[PDB]
Swiss-Prot record:
Binds 1 Fe cation per subunit. Coiled coil: none annotated. It catalyses: (5Z,8Z,11Z,14Z)-eicosatetraenoate + O2 = (12S)-hydroperoxy-(5Z,8Z,10E,14Z)-eicosatetraenoate; (5Z,8Z,11Z,14Z)-eicosatetraenoate + O2 = (15S)-hydroperoxy-(5Z,8Z,11Z,13E)-eicosatetraenoate; (9Z,12Z)-octadecadienoate + O2 = (13S)-hydroperoxy-(9Z,11E)-octadecadienoate; (5Z,8Z,11Z,14Z)-eicosatetraenoate + 2 O2 = (14R,15S)-dihydroperoxy-(5Z,8Z,10E,12E)-eicosatetraenoate. SUPFAM superfamilies: Lipase/lipooxygenase domain (PLAT/LH2 domain), Lipoxigenase. This is Polyunsaturated fatty acid lipoxygenase ALOX15. Interacts with PEBP1; in response to IL13/interleukin-13, prevents the interaction of PEBP1 with RAF1 to activate the ERK signaling cascade. InterPro entries: LipOase, LipOase_C, LipOase_C_sf, LipOase_CS, LipOase_Fe_BS, LipOase_mml, PLAT/LH2_dom, PLAT/LH2_dom_sf. Non-heme iron-containing dioxygenase that catalyzes the stereo-specific peroxidation of free and esterified polyunsaturated fatty acids generating a spectrum of bioactive lipid mediators. It inserts peroxyl groups at C12 or C15 of arachidonate ((5Z,8Z,11Z,14Z)-eicosatetraenoate) producing both 12-hydroperoxyeicosatetraenoate/12-HPETE and 15-hydroperoxyeicosatetraenoate/15-HPETE. It may then act on 12-HPETE to produce hepoxilins, which may show pro-inflammatory properties. Can also peroxidize linoleate ((9Z,12Z)-octadecadienoate) to 13-hydroperoxyoctadecadienoate. Residues 115-662 form the Lipoxygenase domain.
Length: 662
């Protein structure tokens, strides 16, 4: 048989190897020796024809060995393909996409994919058991802080497996751009070092972060209650807002407040009353920067949806009611300018804290990390489900360790400017585990329980729904090719351990929240994987992407507050200024909002990954349909935003990354 064996080397910097690599072809019936054929050239696809007398049959594996003489050289193998030039057979695909190190003999299965149940021959059975044992030695759980959901084991990036590390081409650009980014900002902001700081207009002096079309709008009108409430719907953090069924029990009224109660009852029966509650911030210890006391608040904001499709704030309560003590003052738009302005600033500051911590870090980065480690420890390379998820898990462990090394680590970024940093952030993050429910990660159920379905004013809910349907079908499409009966899913030990690693191990008992302990059906499994895929794409991008727009104008998103939240209604121009961050803190904030949210040097759009793990044409068809539905969504949304005054685009397949990486 005449075969053209083709081996593809990585496009990295250290991908090429000076060592000679020997291959072997082992099929359904027998195996053949090929020996040293070529030497891995960096970013070079190399093919060659060979002829073997021994009958192989269906090629199952392609074993390789990298022999080194005196100095070993790492080799990042993309894949190996061996096709029969004579017989009418399909090209045998053998995906690798990882680093190859050591004088150990590696084995690459064919890219078809299958499970233990779907492999009755037991051809790949022994292969996957030995691989997973090694996977577990490489991927272990760790604990950055006690009480939180597990993360990857280790402390530094060096503790991460080489395959999870940044490619040398991205690592240099990721760090360079970040360095030049914050320095440029630090330079210009140092000029204001002696500039007056007594009017809110002075905030415009430091403003020079990104200055986008939307970001300018914010500067133009942040004091507008219309934009204020608009952010609860389509802002950077649309997770807290929900439709009110009844008045919040913490919404207690001070003696005299009876007229306002009727305005609240009017909106409730109409079904236009909404509430965003920040009680999670209660009793969280605030930061201490330079021995100066910072302050937090647990506000409540009541809003009404206007017939012209506008959400407007009605009342803001800054403290939670103290049992046994008189009720705290409620602030209304009727209050003096400065008094209402201060209360909105406290709400924006608190939204920032919860956004970055819960919405972003926890619900986005850490959750994904949980999925990542559970995938690598329970699902073998050949597993069909494993091949579906991996692109979405790209560069996740790396960016997370980078965060726990200076972004949220002790004496890190939060501690330096964030009011929650310095202890309270962990307190807020640890206690936020209870709010992590299975339904909250699924749009069809999230907006359902909250009550944002059908709300035309909420573009997030719409886009979240549409996107979820597309993904859902893609997973259903892939899972359908490998799971035809519910018993298949039910008896998939690997699949069952994966789901176990997540709900029970990773998430520390998430069954009490809503996460399943076992996937017994096919439709249930499809919903779980979609939930995973969505968390590493949509859930993160819908929260990450708005940072450059809303958190750049400090007055709209204060990183900290120098004065405690007002207990009386007598705020003045100076007090608002004193409460808000000074030039020292605000400027640092802007330079840091660029870190937690920005455009990545090289970015991979949702569903647009290059690594090919499947070999069949059927899996590909499903992949192509997925890319098709996404493309048409990205265009339609683009057209829709034309008519929109403030275009919502945080869920567009073109800018929505395929994995959590920034
Ligand atoms: Fe992010």
């Amino acid at each position: 048989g005449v075969y053209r064996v083709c081996v593809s080397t990585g496009a990295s910097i250290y991908a090429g190897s000076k060592n000679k690599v020997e291959l072997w072809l082992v099929g359904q019936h027998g195996e053949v020796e090929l020996g040293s054929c070529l030497r891995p050239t960096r970013n070079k696809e190399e093919e060659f024809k060979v002829n073997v007398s021994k009958y192989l049959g269906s090629l199952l594996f392609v074993r390789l060995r990298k022999k080194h003489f005196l100095k070993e050289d790492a080799w990042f193998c993309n894949w190996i393909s061996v096709q029969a030039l004579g017989a009418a057979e399909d090209k045998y695909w053998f995906p690798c996409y990882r680093w190859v190190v050591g004088d150990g003999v590696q084995s690459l299965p064919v890219g078809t994919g299958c499970t233990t149940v779907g492999d009755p021959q037991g051809l790949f059975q022994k292969h996957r058991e030995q691989e997973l044992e090694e996977r577990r030695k490489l991927y272990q759980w760790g604990s950055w802080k006690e009480g939180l959901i597990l993360n990857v084991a280790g402390s530094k990036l060096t503790d991460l497996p080489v395959d999870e590390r940044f490619l040398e081409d991205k690592k240099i650009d990721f760090e360079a751009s970040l360095a030049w980014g914050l320095a440029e900002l630090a330079l210009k902001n140092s000029l204001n070092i002696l500039a007056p700081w007594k009017t809110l207009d002075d905030f415009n002096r430091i403003f020079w972060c990104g200055r986008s079309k939307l970001a300018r709008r914010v500067r133009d009108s942040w004091q507008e209650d219309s934009l204020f409430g608009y952010q609860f719907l389509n802002g950077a953090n649309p997770m807290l807002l929900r439709r009110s069924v009844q008045l919040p029990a913490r919404l207690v009224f001070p003696p005299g407040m009876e007229e306002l109660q009727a305005q609240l009852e009017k909106e409730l029966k109409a079904g236009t009353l909404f509430e965003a509650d920040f009680a999670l911030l209660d009793n969280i210890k605030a930061n201490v920067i330079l021995y100066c006391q910072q302050y937090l608040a647990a506000p409540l904001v009541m809003l009404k949806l206007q017939p012209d499709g506008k959400l407007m704030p009605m009342v803001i309560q800054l403290h939670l009611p103290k049992i046994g003590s008189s009720p705290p003052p409620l602030f209304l738009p009727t209050d003096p300018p400065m008094v209402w302005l201060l209360a909105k600033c406290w709400v924006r500051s608190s939204d920032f804290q919860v956004h970055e911590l819960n919405s972003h870090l926890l619900r986005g980065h850490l959750m994904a990390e949980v999925f990542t480690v559970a995938t690598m420890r329970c699902l073998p390379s050949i597993h069909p489900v494993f091949k579906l998820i991996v692109p979405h898990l790209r560069y996740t462990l790396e960016i997370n360790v980078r965060a726990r090394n200076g972004l949220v680590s002790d004496f890190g970024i939060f501690d330096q400017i964030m009011s929650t940093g310095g202890g309270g952030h962990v307190q807020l993050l640890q206690q936020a585990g209870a709010f992590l429910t299975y339904r909250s990660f699924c749009p069809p159920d999230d907006l359902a329980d909250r009550g944002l379905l059908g709300v035309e004013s909420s573009f997030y809910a719409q886009d979240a729904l549409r996107l979820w349907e597309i993904i859902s079908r893609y997973v259903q499409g892939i899972m359908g090719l490998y799971y035809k009966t519910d018993e298949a899913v039910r008896d998939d030990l690997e699949l069952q351990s994966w789901c176990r690693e997540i709900t029970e191990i990773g998430l520390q008992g998430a069954q009490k929240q809503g996460f399943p302990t076992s996937l017994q059906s096919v439709a249930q499994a499809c919903h779980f994987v979609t939930m995973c895929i969505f968390t590493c794409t949509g859930q993160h991008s819908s929260i990450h992407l708005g940072q450059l727009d809303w958190f750049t104008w400090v007055p709209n998103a204060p990183c900290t507050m120098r004065l405690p939240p007002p207990t009386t209604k007598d705020a003045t121009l100076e007090t608002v200024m004193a409460t808000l961050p000074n030039l020292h803190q605000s400027s640092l904030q802007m330079s840091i909002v660029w870190q937690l949210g920005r455009d990545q040097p090289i970015m991979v759009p949702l569903g647009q990954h290059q690594e090919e793990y499947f070999s069949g044409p059927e899996p590909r068809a499903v992949l192509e349909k997925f890319r098709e539905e996404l493309a048409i969504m990205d265009k339609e949304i683009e057209v829709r935003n034309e008519k929109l005054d403030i275009p919502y685009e945080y869920l567009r397949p073109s800018i929505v990354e395929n994995s959590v990486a920034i």
